[PDB]
């Protein structure tokens, strides 16, 4: 029959979900859910302009405010940015792997002053 490659055609909904999934938190904020579509679609990676994301961005909001699988966490203390995630017993518990990040350098070495060049 046809189709033989890709999931034929993943809804927003899924898409979203598979973000929360991929995440080791299994929750993402919203910036978090763009990124990874981004990175994991061809199409959103494309779509990924400025003015085109006023329909990109809200139709996850739509999809994620009919909260049927979808649940909201508030954040520690700067909750600006809300979590996102999956209802727990609406599902099976899994885990996702982790790897290294973040590095250091520096860019100074000496401070700029000059004065008192006189008697």
Same mark, same amino acid.
């Given at each position: ?28 904020? =919203? ?7 981004? %990175? #994991? ?7 990924? !302009?400025? @003015? +085109? ?32 995630? =999956? ?7 899994? %885990? #996702? ?7 250091? !350098?520096? @860019? +100074? ?11």
């Amino acid at each position: 029959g046809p189709l033989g490659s890709a999931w034929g055609n993943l809804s927003y909904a899924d898409l979203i979900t598979k973000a929360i999934e991929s995440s080791a938190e299994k929750r993402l904020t =919203l910036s978090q859910i763009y990124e990874w579509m981004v %990175k #994991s679609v061809p199409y959103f990676k494309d779509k990924g !302009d400025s @003015n +085109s994301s006023a329909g990109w961005k809200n139709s996850i909001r739509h999809n994620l405010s009919l909260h049927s699988k979808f649940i909201r966490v508030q954040n520690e203390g700067t909750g600006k940015s809300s979590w996102w995630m =999956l209802n727990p017993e609406g599902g099976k518990s899994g %885990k #996702s792997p982790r790897r290294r990040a973040a590095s250091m !350098d520096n @860019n +100074s070495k000496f401070a700029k002053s000059r004065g008192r060049a006189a008697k």
